[PDB]
Amino acid sequence: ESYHKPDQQKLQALKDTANRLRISSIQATTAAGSGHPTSCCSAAEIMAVLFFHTMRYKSQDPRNPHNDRFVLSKGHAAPILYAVWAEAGFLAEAELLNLRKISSDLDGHPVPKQAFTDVATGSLGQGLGAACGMAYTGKYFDKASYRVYCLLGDGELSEGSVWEAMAFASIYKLDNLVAILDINRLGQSDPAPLQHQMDIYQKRCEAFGWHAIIVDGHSVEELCKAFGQAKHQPTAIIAKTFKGRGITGVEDKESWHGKPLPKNMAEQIIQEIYSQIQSKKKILATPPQEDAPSVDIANIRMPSLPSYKVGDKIATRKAYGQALAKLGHASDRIIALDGDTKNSTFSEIFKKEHPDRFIECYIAEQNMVSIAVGCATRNRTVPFCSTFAAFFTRAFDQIRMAAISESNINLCGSHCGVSIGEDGPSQMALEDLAMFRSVPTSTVFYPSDGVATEKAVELAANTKGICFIRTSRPENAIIYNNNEDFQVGQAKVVLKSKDDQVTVIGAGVTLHEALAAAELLKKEKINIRVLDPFTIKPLDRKLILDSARATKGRILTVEDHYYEGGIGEAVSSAVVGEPGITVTHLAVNRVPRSGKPAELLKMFGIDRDAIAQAVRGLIT
Amino acid sequence: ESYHKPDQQKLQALKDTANRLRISSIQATTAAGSGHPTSCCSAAEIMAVLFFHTMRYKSQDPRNPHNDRFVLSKGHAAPILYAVWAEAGFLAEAELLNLRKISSDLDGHPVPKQAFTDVATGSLGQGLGAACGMAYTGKYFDKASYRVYCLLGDGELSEGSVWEAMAFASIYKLDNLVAILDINRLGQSDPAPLQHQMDIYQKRCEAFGWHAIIVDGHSVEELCKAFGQAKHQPTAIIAKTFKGRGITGVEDKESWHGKPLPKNMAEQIIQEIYSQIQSKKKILATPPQEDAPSVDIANIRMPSLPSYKVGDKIATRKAYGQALAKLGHASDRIIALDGDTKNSTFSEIFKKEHPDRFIECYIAEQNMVSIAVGCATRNRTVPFCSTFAAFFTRAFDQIRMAAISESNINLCGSHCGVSIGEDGPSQMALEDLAMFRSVPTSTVFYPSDGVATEKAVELAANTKGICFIRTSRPENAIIYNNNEDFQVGQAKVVLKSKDDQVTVIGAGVTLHEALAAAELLKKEKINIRVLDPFTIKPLDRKLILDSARATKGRILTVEDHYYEGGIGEAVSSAVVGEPGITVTHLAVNRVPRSGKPAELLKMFGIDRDAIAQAVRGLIT
Ligand SMILES: Cc1ncc(C[n+]2c([C@](O)(CO)[C@@H](O)[C@H](O)COP(=O)(O)O)sc(CCOP(=O)(O)OP(=O)(O)O)c2C)c(N)n1
Ligand SMILES: Cc1ncc(C[n+]2c([C@](O)(CO)[C@@H](O)[C@H](O)COP(=O)(O)O)sc(CCOP(=O)(O)OP(=O)(O)O)c2C)c(N)n1
Ligand SMILES: [Ca+2]
Ligand SMILES: [Ca+2]
């Protein structure tokens, strides 16, 4: 479609719109007694032009799959986002005044309970990565005409995650993506480092492969023109603005970030702004080309049962890659992402079979998670991210925000625990159960063999929320029949007898150590019950207690993880106060070191001999 | 000192050195059966020139405070680090062959049990930030002549944390810092994005304010020359190299990252490399100018007791800033860092009083933690970092690696829980107890009033490991006398009577809600015991159980945190299986939303009325 070059009346209407957006942002934050009107006001012309000249969207259906996407990365400008959606006719204008109330959904930062919000962005520096996932999806998966626009602050640009996204967009030629940089000189507590050195921003953006245009961010004409040309590259509109623009005596001043105008001041400023508005008539939104495809919503099923053989040996990391590739044959919705670790996590198997649905994210875990979140928005794909579980700690804030975003993403972290051996603690995930259990929407799978791994992948694909699958580096025996039924929140008793003296709960490598301990103890005429949780969250409390009541109330948990936040603590919280129930823990008590896997399991007190000794001490 | 321009014999000796380093890296990784010889070999000339021409250090005292610093950011090149320290005469050459053994300290990645290692770096992208902290300390605190050199991989440069460090170094004019980029074309599982596009690397470095020099990374002469001029800016030596350099048939090839040569191959390659070595004579290290000052090691004490008044109201976030500024008067070792949040965390009070010891880190939490780690190396400073606790999740991998680095840093996270009110969940720390409890060397302080906050700051300053102080946004009453004694692992019973029916454990805002619940329950003739943990890690198990035995075995925990990994789970793990002991939990069950603090405490079931109801249900 051609650019529609606006006339002076349209330009004036866009100015009027910007000023209405300023007034609303002030009114709402003054009413609330909190918020960030000066951060809204620097962005008012940008927002007016995007929503009422450049973008194409259905105003009454913000989630429509054909719409252009807008991501407010500087999420504390939420009041002006709400104001544009009232101006567009979706929100009632009276509701704006209920900003931040417990009776409203116009919360302090944007959240997906709002139809017009796809991702939550209040932790700065994350919106551009989500926008990259949306743009990648638009260009390569949906193959649709929608564009993606992301508004960032200048202080925000200090976050490394932004630059990971910058680099991703140029690697992947996201010529459907526009970043708008609100260069208002100031952050929260001081000027942003570069202030109004517009040329350095341009140099940085260009060095990272973007087409960079410096504009007057308070000129509706310059904005219309800059937004109105498509490029063959991701485009950065570097907008020189003033914080608090239009608020006389606050514009360009320190000490005003996140400070509402008092009521007396708001009334005076609003009258000033209102005196600049030429007409009350509002501009209408323009709708999109409806070329996004249908996506199916059905259950994704593996094409056959697992085909492992009991007693064969495979690492659960390898079983993950096999299972993910298998699942990719059943549905085109499955996509895989990895951070330069595909030959360690075995996501390379998916890449080999389904290359068009694999996204190489390079050594940039933060951005990888954000790409996945963006790809999952509007249910366009079902993503599986992978790296070493230890390196998901690099992305915890992205994961945390993914739950606030109500996102359905799947994460598989390999190389858990000391059982990796020789690389040492930098590579050892010992806190990943703690981290993922603390994520409110999470489901935590810890498969102990290849069969359980395949079933975990299938279940994860069909489970909402943040799904985490913990995989292991070393090879262990297949213990489950291929036709064993697995469910979220259902554990398995893998060894039992009528005279079991302890219930030993292990997972992954420690399950296999517990089975070996049972063989040791047999020599001594001591039987133990062995339980494999399958999911750590939710935990099968019923089977755990039923087991413990069969074994004189005694539970021993053994885990390749630190003591805090892992399996032992989950079990203890589940059962504390149950009469007759005792819980004893074996876990890793300190930062490990290099050695062979078996040597480290021994050193850190979580191998067969440590388990056997703990069982004997219980009994006596 | 002038540059010493090397003769051809010195250059040949540096080539010989590089080749010896290659041979050792191959021998050690072949002996181990794991490791990364091709990543060593690309860096061999760089390492030879740095250690045997450019840097100044005491070879027999690697930790000496006068020494130049070297940071191996690409930590999987550890075998070549070990080899240089054997070449320098510190390590025995035979020990190199014990790489990765449980009987050795030559672990898979560098760790500070090695005298020659200050920070652990195996999680990529973190070394440059630590190096920035070292350089900042050298230039501004020690005011010493040592320089700081940091070797990075090219794949590694995809990490956003690197670019945060890049920007920090130019903001702070770190003209004593050199980054060496090993542009060997390849990452782990594919070519690095930019491959050998040396000009783009240069453009990126220059756009971020560095003086950038492209060199042949296998030319000892070019390296000597590039390293031999100081600049008025941080300097990036952008070295074009080949992965596996010198290994015939492996050089510049895929499928060799992290793969040892077999033994048969190693023998053939080593003979080839050895045939290139002209002389066995080794170059000697050159020592430093001894101009680093004395740093005292004594206990840091507050200059007076707290001066709060019982019944006055202050937020613990404000008490933190007051206490940190006070402590800064007692010792010059205290430094403060903050990520554009100083006016929210109240670290601005320290900045006002001690500006030369405040480091503005901007909106870059990853880098902030790494700067702190670097500043703490060799005990040069005692750093206190602050931001919102929620945003420490952005830096979890840096924190995790700080514990592997045996680092003594202090972190204060504000704005915990739903009690912040209107900003909503993006700002609410609800997983920070889970995260910090999972860090092995951590001490977790949760002060409930201003007095406890001041005492926590003092105790943290004098405590080794990762200290975390959780502060709160709203004002609460002072409840402790100024002369109350506080200790790590010692809780306080703040309300008791002889007929207490439940022990209620709360902290911060929930302690105050528990005290208000006690007043509600009095009306009903029900007394409760109220316990303030002070430290969540370590937990005063003795006082908790002694309390519970006085209150019919009943414990109720109430926390402004998610259920997993917080106070309730810590208490449950501590006491599970104690006869007669029951533990009931109140916590936040899902992602919150905006509202007034009191409204959210109510919505999420952790205010006075929720506590009173849980107590009644126990009793009945
Ligand atoms: C990852 C990260 N790190 C820091 C911050 C804090 N922060 C912002 C807010 O969190 C708002 O989102 C902050 O203002 C709080 O509301 C303050 O709470 P109080 O209780 O003290 O009232 S916003 C911000 C500065 C951003 O500057 P720019 O990017 O330049 O944007 P602009 O406003 O100039 O347009 C900071 C540091 C967050 N949120 N995320
Ligand atoms: C933050 C982060 N993310 C990813 C990685 C993985 N990784 C590296 C290693 O972790 C080594 O430190 C990896 O090779 C493991 O040893 C493999 O374990 P296996 O069990 O599979 O054997 S190293 C690396 C690639 C780095 O490339 P460059 O920066 O270009 O360096 P160079 O080798 O070319 O000089 C990756 C992705 C880590 N560690 N950290
Ligand atoms: Ca700004
Ligand atoms: Ca490389």
DSSP B141: I
Residue B142 backbone phi and psi in degrees, to 5: -65, -30
Kindly report the number of other CB atoms within 10 A of residue A356's CB atom.
Answer: 10
Give the closest residue to A439 by CA, choosing from A411, A414, A459: A411
Kindly report the number of other CB atoms within 10 A of residue B417's CB atom.
Answer: 31
What does the buried/exposed string (b/e) look like for B436-459 if buried means 16 or more CB atoms within 10 Å of the residue's CB?
A: bbbbbbbbbbbbbbbbbbbbbbbb
3-state secondary structure of B358: strand
Q: Which residues of A contribute to the annotated binding site for substrate?
A: 36, 257, 317, 344, 415, 423, 473
Chain A residues whose beta carbon lies within 8 Å of the beta carbon of residue B164: 158-160
3-state secondary structure of B600: helix
Q: Which atom of ligand 2 is nearest to the CA of B75?
A: 12
B155 lines ligand 2 (CB under 6 A): yes
What does the buried/exposed string (b/e) look like for B307-333 if buried means 16 or more CB atoms within 10 Å of the residue's CB?
A: ebeeeeebbbbbbbbbbbbbbbebbbb
Give the closest residue to B594 by CA, choosing from A55, A261, A35: A35
Kindly report the number of other CB atoms within 10 A of residue A9's CB atom.
Answer: 10
B346 lines ligand 1 (CB under 6 A): no
Helix (H) or strand (E) run with residue A384 in it: strand A382-388
Q: Which residue has the CA at smallest separation from atom 20 of ligand 2?
A: A344
Is B122 part of the contact surface with chain A (CB cutoff 8 Å)? yes
- Single-letter code of the amino acid located at B529: R
| Cβ(A330)–Cβ(A303) below 8 Å | yes
Q: What is the CA radius of gyration of chain A?
A: 28
| Cβ(B58)–Cβ(B146) below 8 Å | no
For residue A125, give the chain B residue with the closest CA. Answer: B363
Spatial separation of the C-alpha atoms in residues A550 and A495, rounded to whole Å: 13
What does the buried/exposed string (b/e) look like for A24-54 if buried means 16 or more CB atoms within 10 Å of the residue's CB?
A: bbbbbbbbbebbbbbbbbbbbbbbbbbbbbb
Which residues partner with B148 through β-bridges?
B69, B177
Nearest beta carbon to residue A562 from set B207, B440, B590: B440
Residue B162 backbone phi and psi in degrees, to 5: -60, -45
| Cβ(B306)–Cβ(B455) below 8 Å | yes
Q: Peptide bond preceding B440: is omega within 30 degrees of 0, i.e. cis?
A: no
Write the DSSP assignment of B167-187 as a string of letters: HHHHHTT-TTEEEEEEE-SB-
Ligand 1 pocket mutation, candidates B385, B423, B428, criterion most atoms within 8 A of CB:
B423
End-to-end Cα separation, chain B, in angstroms: 82
Q: Give the residue numbers of A marked as catalytic.
A: 365
User: What's the 3-state SS for A273-294?
Assistant: HHCCCCCCCCCCCECCCCCCCC
- Single-letter code of the amino acid located at A25: S
Chain B residues whose beta carbon lies within 8 Å of the beta carbon of residue A121: 426
Helix (H) or strand (E) run with residue B409 in it: strand B409-414
Kindly report the length of chain B.
620
Is A367 part of the contact surface with chain B (CB cutoff 8 Å)? yes
- Single-letter code of the amino acid located at A279: S
Is B186 known to sit in a ligand binding site?
yes
Is B111 part of the contact surface with chain A (CB cutoff 8 Å)? yes
A363 lines ligand 2 (CB under 6 A): yes
For the record, the structure tokens of B599 come out as 């409204």
Spatial separation of the C-alpha atoms in residues A564 and A570, rounded to whole Å: 9
Is B565 part of the contact surface with chain A (CB cutoff 8 Å)? yes
User: What's the 3-state SS for B511-546?
Assistant: HHHHHHHHHHHHCCCCEEEEEECCEEECCCHHHHHH
Helix (H) or strand (E) run with residue B383 in it: strand B382-388
Residue A611 backbone phi and psi in degrees, to 5: -65, -45
| Cβ(B551)–Cβ(B521) below 8 Å | no
Q: Which residue has the CA at smallest separation from atom 10 of ligand 1?
A: B427
| Cβ(A207)–Cβ(A248) below 8 Å | no
Residue B561 backbone phi and psi in degrees, to 5: -170, 160
What does the buried/exposed string (b/e) look like for A363-398 if buried means 16 or more CB atoms within 10 Å of the residue's CB?
A: bbbbbbbbbbbbbbbbebbbbbbbbbbbbbbbbbbb
Are the Cβ atoms of B363 and A156 closer than 8 angstroms?
yes
Among positive and negative, which fits the CA dihedral B575, B580, B581, B582? Answer: positive
Is A98 part of the contact surface with chain B (CB cutoff 8 Å)? no
From residue A524, alpha-carbon distances to A180, A506, A608 in Å are 71, 21, 14
Which of B128, B158, B233 should be substituted to probe chain A, the one whose Cβ sees the most A Cβ atoms within 10 Å? B158
- Single-letter code of the amino acid located at A456: A
Helix (H) or strand (E) run with residue A519 in it: helix A509-522
What number of C-beta contacts closer than 8 Å exist between A and B? Answer: 328
Q: What is the CA radius of gyration of chain B?
A: 28
Give the closest residue to B108 by CA, choosing from A166, A533, A592: A592
For the record, the structure tokens of B261 come out as 């040569």
Spatial separation of the C-alpha atoms in residues A20 and A285, rounded to whole Å: 16
Resolution in Å, one decimal, please.
1.0
Are the Cβ atoms of A121 and B426 closer than 8 angstroms?
yes
Kindly report the length of chain A.
620
For the record, the structure tokens of A311 come out as 């007693």
**How close is the nearest chain A Cα to the Cα of B142, in Å?**
25
Spatial separation of the C-alpha atoms in residues B133 and A554, rounded to whole Å: 50
Helical pair B160-171 and B127-136, crossing angle rounded to 10 deg: 20
| Cβ(B513)–Cβ(B601) below 8 Å | yes
Helical pair A8-32 and A220-228, crossing angle rounded to 10 deg: 110
Spatial separation of the C-alpha atoms in residues A188 and A506, rounded to whole Å: 48
From residue A280, alpha-carbon distances to A14, A24, A28, A269, A277 in Å are 11, 14, 19, 18, 7
Q: Which residues contact A305 (CB under 8 A, 6 or more apart)?
A: A482, A483
Give the closest residue to A32 by CA, choosing from A91, A90, A78: A78
Ligand located closest to B423 CA: 1
Tell me the longest C-alpha to C-alpha distance in chain B: 93
| Cβ(A425)–Cβ(A589) below 8 Å | no
DSSP B391: G
Give the closest residue to A501 by CA, choosing from A559, A547, A565, A439: A547
Q: Which residues contact A245 (CB under 8 A, 6 or more apart)?
A: A22, A41, A42, A44, A184, A218, A251
What are the strands, taking DSSP E only, across A283-366?
313-315, 334-338, 358-360
- Single-letter code of the amino acid located at B425: P
Element counts in chain A: helices (H) and strands (E): 21, 19
B612 burial level (CB within 10 Å; 0-12, 13-18, 19+):
buried
What does the buried/exposed string (b/e) look like for A250-287 if buried means 16 or more CB atoms within 10 Å of the residue's CB?
A: bbbeeebbbbbbeeeebeebbeebeeebeeeeebebbe
Helix (H) or strand (E) run with residue A14 in it: helix A8-32
Element counts in chain B: helices (H) and strands (E): 21, 19
Q: Give the residue numbers of B marked as catalytic.
A: 365
Ligand 1 pocket mutation, candidates A80, A123, A152, A188, criterion most atoms within 8 A of CB:
A188
Which of A238, A423, A562, A563 should be substituted to probe chain B, the one whose Cβ sees the most B Cβ atoms within 10 Å? A423
Pseudo-torsion of CA B39, B45, B51, B55, nearest 10°?
-110
Question: What structural domains and CATH numbers belong to chain A?
Answer: 1-294 (3.40.50.970), 295-488 (3.40.50.970), 489-620 (3.40.50.920)
| Cβ(B465)–Cβ(B443) below 8 Å | yes
B363 lines ligand 1 (CB under 6 A): yes
Is B311 known to sit in a ligand binding site?
no
Are the Cβ atoms of B108 and A594 closer than 8 angstroms?
yes
Helix (H) or strand (E) run with residue B477 in it: strand B475-477
**How close is the nearest chain B Cα to the Cα of A82, in Å?**
15
Q: Which atom of ligand 2 is nearest to the CA of B159?
A: 1
Spatial separation of the C-alpha atoms in residues A272 and A167, rounded to whole Å: 43
Chain B residues whose beta carbon lies within 8 Å of the beta carbon of residue A435: 396, 431, 434-435, 438
End-to-end Cα separation, chain A, in angstroms: 82
Q: H helices within B405-471, ranges in order?
A: 432-437, 450-461
Is A578 part of the contact surface with chain B (CB cutoff 8 Å)? no
**How close is the nearest chain A Cα to the Cα of B156, in Å?**
6
A124 lines ligand 1 (CB under 6 A): yes
Spatial separation of the C-alpha atoms in residues B157 and B201, rounded to whole Å: 10
What are the strands, taking DSSP E only, across A446-566?
466-470, 475-477, 492-495, 500-505, 527-532, 535-537, 554-562
A167: alpha, beta or left? (left if phi > 0; alpha if psi -120 to 50): alpha
CA B346 / ligand 1 centre spacing (Å):
15
| Cβ(B174)–Cβ(B205) below 8 Å | no
Q: Which residues contact B45 (CB under 8 A, 6 or more apart)?
A: B14, B15, B18, B217, B218, B219, B220, B223
Write the DSSP assignment of A44-79 as a string of letters: HHHHHHIIIII-B--TT-TT-TTSPEEEESSGGGHH
Spatial separation of the C-alpha atoms in residues A150 and B185, rounded to whole Å: 32
Spatial separation of the C-alpha atoms in residues B471 and B452, rounded to whole Å: 11
Instruction: Specify the long-range contacts of residues A539-544, CB closer than 8 Å, at least 24 apart.
Output: A539/A489, A539/A491, A539/A570, A539/A571, A539/A574, A540/A489, A540/A490, A540/A491, A541/A574, A541/A575, A543/A490, A543/A491, A543/A493, A544/A491, A544/A503, A544/A505, A544/A571, A544/A574, A544/A575
A276: alpha, beta or left? (left if phi > 0; alpha if psi -120 to 50): alpha
Q: Please, which experimental method was used?
A: X-ray
Q: Which residues contact A616 (CB under 8 A, 6 or more apart)?
A: A521, A524, A526
| Cβ(A412)–Cβ(A385) below 8 Å | yes
HSE (side-chain half, CA atoms, 13 Å) at B571: 31
DSSP A123: S
Spatial separation of the C-alpha atoms in residues B287 and B304, rounded to whole Å: 44
Give the closest residue to B121 by CA, choosing from B86, B91, B165: B165
Ligand located closest to A394 CA: 2
